[PDB]
A paper describes a structure:
The tripartite motif (TRIM) proteins form one of the largest subfamilies of RING-type E3 ubiquitin ligases, comprising more than 80 members. TRIM family members typically contain a RING domain usually catalyzing ubiquitin transfer; one or two B-box domains mediating protein–protein interactions; and a large coiled-coil domain region, which is involved in self-association or oligomerization with other TRIM E3-ligase proteins. About two-thirds of human TRIM proteins feature a PRYSPRY domain, also known as the B30.2 domain, in their C-terminal region.
A characteristic feature of the putative substrate-binding site in the closely related homologs MID1 and MID2 is an arginine located at the C-terminus of β-strand 7 (R587 in MID1 and R637 in MID2) that projects its guanidinium group toward the center of the cavity and two neighboring tryptophan residues lining the pocket. The MID2 domain was solved in two different crystal forms. In the C2221 crystal form, which contains one protein molecule per asymmetric unit, the side chains of Trp602 and Trp694 engage in π-stacking interactions. In some cases, such as MID2, it may be possible to target transient protein states with more open pockets, provided these states are sufficiently populated in solution.
Author numbering:
A (entry chain A): 531 to 559, 575 to 710
B (entry chain B): 530 to 559, 576 to 710
The structure:
């Protein structure tokens, strides 16, 4: 795997978000406060995790540059996200959403971007569990996106594929 | 480079009232509640991190096997911990504690066990900041220990040390 490490991009992060000095944590200081990773990916296979804790409302995924800044909740043709709203989990892309069954107490999300094999997959790593795979023939470079309403989020990047993947 | 390997909580060392994720990396309380990592270290240099989130009372460190089970909060000669209790941070060993100046909003603790060079160091990795170093001539192998009185912890093991260390 090619898992390039990355940080949250201060140039692409909503002003209502405070980013840690090491670029791996964000918390709140349309209503959606988005941040983008500081890399674009156009090859290889990459895995990162997000620690969401008790956050009840978020959208995590990837986007083309053709997705406008802070529009990373799967409501255009350039944004793919896994999203939580209370007990309802969906994947969403181009305003089309599909319900995803998730075991209770999801605190950490795994994101597997297999760019070369045209897949974006979401995982519940605590349960070693695949949640959903988008089959996408990517036509532009993609960057990680993280959108929250409140509370906080930490990114675990540059990761080897977990043994169960 | 570091010798850090992935470890998880040892199920046989976990307090009965802790809820543990299936991958052994998350512990939650629904009298301190201690758990120990499933590795005893007697060589090399190791780094792991703990995500504490909103927990206001925890103790994180290492222990010899001679520390009694669940007595991993620095109140014997076999336990070295970094601990938060509300707004006070201390390191504690052999039932003696020293206050530690910690920047606000510590959500993640770095633990650097340099077993070969007889040191245990605690870090605020978000701020690339050294917090405390114990000099310890280790006479037995040591295991990671994690103790909470509320909320939850997540263990980040086997990941590359941050560049600043």
């Amino acid at each position: 795997m090619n898992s390039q490490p990355f940080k949250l991009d201060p140039k692409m992060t909503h002003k209502k978000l405070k980013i840690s000095n090491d670029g791996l944590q964000m918390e709140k200081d349309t209503g959606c406060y988005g941040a983008a990773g500081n890399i674009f990916i156009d090859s290889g296979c990459h895995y990162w995790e997000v620690v969401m804790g008790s956050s009840t409302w978020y959208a995590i995924g990837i986007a083309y540059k053709s997705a406008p800044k802070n529009e990373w909740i799967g409501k255009n043709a350039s944004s793919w996200v896994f999203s939580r709203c209370n007990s309802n989990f969906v994947v969403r892309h181009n305003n089309k959403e599909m319900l995803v069954d998730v075991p209770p107490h999801l605190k950490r999300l795994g994101v597997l971007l297999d760019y070369d094999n045209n897949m974006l997959s979401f995982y519940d790593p605590a349960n070693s569990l695949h949640l959903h795979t988008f089959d996408v023939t990517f036509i532009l470079p993609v960057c990680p996106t993280f959108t929250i309403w409140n509370k906080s989020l930490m990114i675990l990047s540059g990761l080897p594929a977990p043994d169960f993947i």
